[PDB]
Amino acid sequence: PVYEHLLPVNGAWRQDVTNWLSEDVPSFDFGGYVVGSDLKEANLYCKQDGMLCGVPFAQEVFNQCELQVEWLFKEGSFLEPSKNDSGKIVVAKITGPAKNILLAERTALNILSRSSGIATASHKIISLARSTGYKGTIAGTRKTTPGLRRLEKYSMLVGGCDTHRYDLSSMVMLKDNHIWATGSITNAVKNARAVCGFAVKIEVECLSEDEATEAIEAGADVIMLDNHFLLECSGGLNLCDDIDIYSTSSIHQGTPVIDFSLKLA
Amino acid sequence: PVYEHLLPVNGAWRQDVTNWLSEDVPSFDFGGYVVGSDLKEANLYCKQDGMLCGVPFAQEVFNQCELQVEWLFKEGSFLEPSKNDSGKIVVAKITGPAKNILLAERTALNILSRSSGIATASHKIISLARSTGYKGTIAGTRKTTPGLRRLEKYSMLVGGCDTHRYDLSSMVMLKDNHIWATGSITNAVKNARAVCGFAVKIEVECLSEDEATEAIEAGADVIMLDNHFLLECSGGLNLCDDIDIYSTSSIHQGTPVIDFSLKLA
Amino acid sequence: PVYEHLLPVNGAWRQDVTNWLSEDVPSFDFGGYVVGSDLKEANLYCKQDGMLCGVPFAQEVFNQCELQVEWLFKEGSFLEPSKNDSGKIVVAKITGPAKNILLAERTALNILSRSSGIATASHKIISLARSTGYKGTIAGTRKTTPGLRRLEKYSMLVGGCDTHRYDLSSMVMLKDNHIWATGSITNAVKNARAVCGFAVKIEVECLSEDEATEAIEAGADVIMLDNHFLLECSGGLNLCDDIDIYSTSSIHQGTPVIDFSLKLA
Amino acid sequence: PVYEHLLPVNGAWRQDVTNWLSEDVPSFDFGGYVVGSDLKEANLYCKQDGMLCGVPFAQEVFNQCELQVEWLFKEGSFLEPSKNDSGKIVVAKITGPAKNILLAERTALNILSRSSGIATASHKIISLARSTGYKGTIAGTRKTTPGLRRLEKYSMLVGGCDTHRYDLSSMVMLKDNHIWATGSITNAVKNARAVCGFAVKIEVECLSEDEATEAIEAGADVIMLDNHFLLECSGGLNLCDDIDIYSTSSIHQGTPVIDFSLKLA
Amino acid sequence: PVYEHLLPVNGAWRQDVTNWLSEDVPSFDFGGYVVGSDLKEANLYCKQDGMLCGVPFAQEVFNQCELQVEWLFKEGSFLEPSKNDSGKIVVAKITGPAKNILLAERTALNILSRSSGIATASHKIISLARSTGYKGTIAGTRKTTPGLRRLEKYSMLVGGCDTHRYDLSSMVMLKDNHIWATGSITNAVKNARAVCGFAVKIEVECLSEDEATEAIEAGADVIMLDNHFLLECSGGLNLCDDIDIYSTSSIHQGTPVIDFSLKLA
Amino acid sequence: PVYEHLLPVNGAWRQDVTNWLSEDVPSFDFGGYVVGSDLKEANLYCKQDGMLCGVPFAQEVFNQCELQVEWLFKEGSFLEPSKNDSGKIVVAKITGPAKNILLAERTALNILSRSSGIATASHKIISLARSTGYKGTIAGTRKTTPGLRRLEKYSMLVGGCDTHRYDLSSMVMLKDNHIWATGSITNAVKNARAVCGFAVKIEVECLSEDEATEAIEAGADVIMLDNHFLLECSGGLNLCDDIDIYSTSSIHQGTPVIDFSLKLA
């Protein structure tokens, strides 16, 4: 299958791209005026070892800037301009009006560098906590960048990690707050089920044995223990027991970026 | 003066906040339904040493969620839950309907953690390259997070760094591409000036002495040398000559985040 | 003429379609990922006797999903999968990437089923109150579905009914409230005329003879009697006098839908 | 608990309300000009037996129109202006500028009538298929009105029915198309799981015994048979076996509306 | 009555105001930062003889900038800082944070100056072509400023002129193009009526006697002769016969502006 | 170079065009329905002496209306249908469906007439104050039409004038208000510099010699005297000293329009 197929042929994400362009050009593009529309050739370079990600997003930028691109690598590929036989690697060839190329450049690179960084960190962590023989899964969180959740979750997936719940409208996640708000884990879970129904899972964060057990009997689908049913521990950075899920914002939040660059022939 | 005064009482940034809420709740807030509207008290905790930033943005989230907040620290303050007399520090007191608090929580914390992280890195770098006795300035770049430029530039400022140019509609930045596109640095600069006028500066990236010098005579306001007029070097991470500006995406891109948390009494 | 020509080649209605897609895919299209982009063939089936409507809207969905469609029937056609020689009727042939077809499907069918239902009810009512020899017109109301007024009014037209006034900015409709608000029907009508001018008609709802008559002398273009000038009665469902207009939300509000389906070869 | 708490204090749904107002007043409100701003009193009447629904939405309309409202009944209440001791029932008291009341009126009533209709049909069906002693659940579909999904799903809930899956980004629903697209139910389910992860359920539509059984072994959470795991039958209108879920668009699509009205004192 | 009552308490026009603010502050308001939030007093001055218009729009700007304003003159008032006992006239008193006042200033004044200019020209023309004893009406056109139609039409009204048709969805206006497109004025008018219905008027532009007459018999509501039924001539700037309407873009297009200013105490 | 290259291949300005179309067709295009889609030919005529401007904007309208256009003159060309060998001049040839041409017409002409008017006035003023031998520049202001700033600034440029500062986020412009708000011009300028940095110029309005001089020493880039550093006088309409900049809203605000028309063959 193809990850980019997760993105609907059309939807709000394409308008996100348009807005990112507008964010860069509130009025006029002075540089585009001085450079002109002569057709030009350009290479997109990857200048740091890491996994390529964000291809469909960068491509949408290129599409809206009316350029012709040819990717030399499939998304998800691990690149290693490690050699520095030049120190970098051409991952795409671009053609189009000079101004159009220089306009798409920074926005496109801002997407690739950040999406690749998340993917790279996600992959490092799962493969790492694979190599121990762990069979469970490593998941993300909701601690995403404001306005950039679709892109970052998508990058988690390409990295080989679980996204965990997309938002607050997806899997219900109950805590102590909700628990004694209704009287007991049972009530909290029953009221959650009363509105989410069968199509969506309910997860309850516990801290003891009994607590977990009443949640199970209440109908909870997941139980978070935190630092018929699945088990999850959250926070854990460097431990692997035989829990089903380990959640950590480490694969997506505050991660290093993968450097890219673009140059006209 | 007050940094938050840079933000217009009303504009698109407030709609950005609304959209960040919508990004978290596409349909229903199941948890808000189970917890209810009973008034509750909550403390916002800073769990890592660093500079507080993003206050006006987090406050807008709280405002739209109809809550009452009292900040215990001015924005720009360096916090040091270093002590772990508890390991954390209450930076704000919040009151309002249970559901409203839990709805604002993740979005508000996603803003603070990232804005504080950028501020903290920005401050570390300038103060560092201060301590050497350098009198010039440290600036950022355009390698910002897509859709989050206002917030990140704002954080650079609070950190004590220069934002550098906001976008492509602000200071013109000419390169080799534009240069031989018109015939010479002089032409590129003349065509740029022809459209940007007197109100906006023109910066030309050079690589030699003469080049710099023709740019100066052409009317360039800044000259980038890269790895009446000002001088700037770009890339430099760990060197301080007596240049006027040192640009590096290090103070804002791929920076660690500062951990925060929120808990109901 | 062609009804779909009422829709401007470009305007907000096309953005409505985009938003309907986003409403169905807030994050990822998991099914589109599992099915892939292989080209596929598909038939759009009409599974209930009724008039075909909403063609230009369904087509916009197909266009944005980048598919190739061929309609086998003109909009406004009465279909009668009455036969159940199969029980259904292929009204369109579609081709395109598997994922793209399944993405457009539900949204496209939600449009056709509802637009056809309105058209079908509208047609049934006018033709019915035709067959009596009535020469006047049957009109709709403003009791449309929130956010879907353009589509429903358009469907009323295809059905052979009058839309009546599109909104509150179109024909002025005065009631008792406005009447004694100024002192008399004459004043209400004079103040309405004072702002709407000659380009827009003024309608006054009366309940007696004199009332109607003062409205006529005041300059009213239409007089509603309700359960140089035209006459209208509103509410009436099952009566036909020689009034000019009979208004009823029955041709568009709370009407049955016409079932459609889509299947890949 | 309170159903309206499912709605986030702020999000896109409130902007939906604003747009519904704009849809009614593209330019000027001639009637509002003739009536004026004098404070007025108004009663909201329910003129048909059915369940009250859409309260938070109608209230948002009233809020944006700056009016004061007092609801005489809790949402979810079954009303029976059956008596026609007057034939109707005051469900809310409104106060505010004349023009503001008449502006909110049609939009507010268009919401109540349709939301109550859906709720009423939903309730009739579950209670009905309750009375047989059926312990399973009755669910809706994705055949919602374009642009009005949040409101209609919300109404399904108030009616006492399950919403079923909200959209295509929520529970994965695999069919034959996806099945042989990968080679087997097992593959389809494995690829779906590969992208949706543990937080979201996977449902597979089958037509035989074995098929169901391979889906179960593949990891499917639900199995649709259509006309550890749950079972669902879809289409069924008037049959109740001991399946877990019965899906039908009947509780929300093409349902009669509940008539309301508003009158100034 | 009050003209500002034509504007719905809430709708897109208020979002237009927000966007006008964003158009002025894409990133930061440097001046607002240097001036601060200290409360200040300010007078809004009218520096040129003309009619005051655009009050509700300027007020919305002030409202969104959270200021307190007191208008010293009703909208529609003719001002004559003719005296230059100072040369200007305080039309409003404003109070609020320094930064908030200076932010609203230019946008608010850009609205008043242009709306007053249109009103002033509109009034000059009708009063002028009043003074001749003409009893007909002077109307505008569709040659409005892109994106500013609501404001300019509204200003035409305050000036004492007819707006003429608001847009292409309001009164149908047929020309030769449409006429021979169907075969004859009769056909064009019949097809127009077939879609616009009774609620909207149809206007046909003629150039001869017979032409006018067939339009009348076809059902046209207005007949334009251009350089039961009404008559209109379009273009005419400096002629008054006993036609009903004289259309000219002169009252709104390319009109001088009325100068205003704002100063802090 | 080409002025239209200042506009980004894609951004908000293209959405502005879409909205201008929606502003003209809130519901249906009755005329487009009566005229049909038959291909037609059309000439765009310039009926008044002046400079052609707004070409890229009018072209976007034509593009969205799916038409084929051929401009007979480069933007910036001075036209002189002075001859009235016919009285007008074909500046563009258009082809496409009848309805599509008539839909784009008014919006396209509203853009050309106003953009050309601004350009024409801008050119008249600079060339005029050229002919005196003045070597400085003539600039505009921020007194632009709400929502139409990009278009009007762009027109100023084509006219041969300086735009002056685009908005409040571009060059800082300090006044007395800001000056004594901090204690002195020096403080105001220092606080402005503290937030705008090196990339953006600071302008201070003075009224005396010393004042100018302290601003210069404070670091101001421009000094406005009003009715290393540059000098500017603002207001001046009919005086030319050897100042660097003369600002006047006369080249863009309240300027006459250049009449255009469109006719089908």
Ligand SMILES: O=C(O)c1cccnc1C(=O)O
């Ligand atoms: O909310 C979540 O989805 C989540 C899931 C696992 C761990 N943390 C979180 C969080 O965002 O705090």
Ligand SMILES: O=C(O)c1cccnc1C(=O)O
């Ligand atoms: O473009 C800029 O503003 C910029 C300024 C200095 C260094 N880098 C950049 C960049 O974004 O590549």
Ligand SMILES: O=C(O)c1cccnc1C(=O)O
């Ligand atoms: O308002 C209208 O257009 C209308 C016209 C006829 C009958 N009812 C209505 C209504 O919406 O209540």
Ligand SMILES: O=C(O)c1cccnc1C(=O)O
């Ligand atoms: O897609 C769904 O969610 C759905 C669920 C059950 C029955 N039908 C459908 C449908 O929309 O066709």
Ligand SMILES: O=C(O)c1cccnc1C(=O)O
């Ligand atoms: O179209 C109109 O409404 C109109 C009405 C009268 C005169 N001109 C026009 C025009 O815009 O060309």
Ligand SMILES: O=C(O)c1cccnc1C(=O)O
């Ligand atoms: O604000 C400006 O940019 C400006 C610049 C020069 C003269 N006036 C102004 C103004 O808008 O009042």
